[PDB]
């Protein structure tokens, strides 16, 4: 979906 | 043409659209650790590596398999470079300038060991982990299928890039001799290349043969082989959008740096303590993101990671060699690095607002 888009952008915010 | 936040979000996107339900469980002992993970795994298909990673590491309390498994890509990470396999060295002294040991045909089923390690990375990469093994920058380059250039062979062997730097600064044939294990073999640079001799319109097409050479003499398929192995698991297609400096830091990750240890650790040459330029330095280095300081540290050392004990313990080629700052060139240039000597050359800039510019752009646009 975009979910997914909306996981990738929450992993950069977290680990960058 | 947008900056490494956005490359992120789209990679990491990218690994996401293409990541598996359900889990798959790894059962090592610490002790055979590495037999145990490399068995695994290359039994294993490899879209099965994006699944949910239940890492069974046996005689275990353990039940946040988050922790085991960051544990796991670390203790790995450092458990492949075990000698007695043959796999990797160093250029330098004090653990200096990873690099492939061409040795590691000696273990007939070497290749594979280099394919497993190629599909350890990309789950490393793949499921957004870290590790520390410290790889060289062209290693990298290398896997983005970029050239590397004269600045990279100053990083890894000074003696080799000050021979070329004489040869292009004066004015032989396209061959060259390699020992391996006591047999010597002449690797022709070119087709016939033991006939052609060196003249000075073929020395610019010379000087870049033995650029290439000398990173891929004798690690030619262990590379080949790394390279399929990661490809096969995640694509480097995947890293098009990337750079060297970039790259590193995905997969080890980012740190807080200790900004005093840093300014208490760094020496100068020519330079004082109390200049104008480095009173400003340490200025532009604090109004500054975390983002960018590793990426200065990258610029300078070669490479974001720290060793134990902090800046004091900065080790270059020719042993220790603290950060270390000169007044070198003119200030119509930019400041360069020589990341051998973890030295930065910076230029007696005339103005605060010239030298915040000029170094970012340093940073930013080179090497
Ligand atoms: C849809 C969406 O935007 N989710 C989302 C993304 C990023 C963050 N930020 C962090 O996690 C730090 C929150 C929610």
Redesign the interface.
């Known amino acids: 979906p975009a979910t997914?888009?909306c996981?990738?952008?929450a992993?950069?915010c977290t680990?960058? | 043409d947008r900056s490494?936040?956005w490359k992120?979000?789209?990679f990491?996107?990218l690994?996401?659209?293409n990541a598996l339900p359900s889990h798959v469980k790894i059962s090592v002992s610490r002790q055979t650790l590495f037999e145990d993970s490399f068995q695994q795994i290359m039994n294993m298909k490899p879209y099965d590596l994006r699944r949910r990673l239940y890492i069974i590491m046996r005689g275990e309390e353990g039940l946040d398999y988050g922790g085991i498994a960051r544990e796991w890509f670390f203790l790995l990470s450092h458990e492949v470079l075990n000698p007695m396999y043959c796999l990797f060295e160093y250029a330098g002294k004090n653990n200096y300038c990873l690099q492939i040991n061409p040795a590691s045909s000696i273990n007939p089923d070497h290749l594979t060991y280099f394919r497993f390690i190629g599909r350890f990375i990309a789950m490393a990469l793949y499921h957004?982990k870290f590790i520390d093994t410290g790889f060289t920058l062209p290693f990298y380059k290398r896997m983005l299928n970029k050239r590397p250039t004269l600045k990279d062979l100053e990083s890894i062997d000074p003696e080799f890039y000050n021979s070329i730097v004489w040869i292009k600064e004066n004015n032989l044939y396209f061959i060259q001799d390699m020992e391996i294990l006591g047999k010597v073999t002449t690797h022709e640079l070119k087709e016939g290349g033991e006939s052609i001799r060196v003249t000075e319109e073929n020395k610019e097409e010379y000087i870049m043969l033995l650029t290439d050479w000398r990173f891929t003499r004798g690690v030619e398929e262990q590379t080949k082989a790394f390279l399929d192995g990661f490809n096969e698991v995640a694509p480097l297609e995947w890293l098009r959008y990337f750079d060297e400096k970039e790259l590193e830091?995905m997969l080890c990750?980012?740190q807080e740096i200790d900004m005093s240890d840093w300014q208490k650790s760094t020496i100068y040459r020519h330079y004082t303590k109390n200049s104008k330029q480095i009173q400003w330095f340490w200025q532009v280095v604090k109004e500054m993101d975390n983002?960018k300081r590793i990426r200065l540290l990258q610029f300078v050392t070669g490479t974001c990671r720290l060793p134990v004990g902090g800046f004091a313990e900065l080790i270059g080629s020719n042993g220790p060699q603290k950060f270390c700052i000169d007044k070198v060139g003119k200030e119509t240039w930019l400041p360069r690095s020589h990341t051998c000597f973890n030295r930065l050359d910076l230029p007696p800039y005339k103005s605060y607002e010239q030298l915040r510019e000029k170094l970012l752009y340093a940073i930013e646009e080179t090497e």
Do not use: N, V, W
């Open positions: 997914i888009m996981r990738a952008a992993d950069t680990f960058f | 490494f936040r992120y979000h789209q990491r996107f690994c996401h659209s957004g830091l990750g980012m983002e």
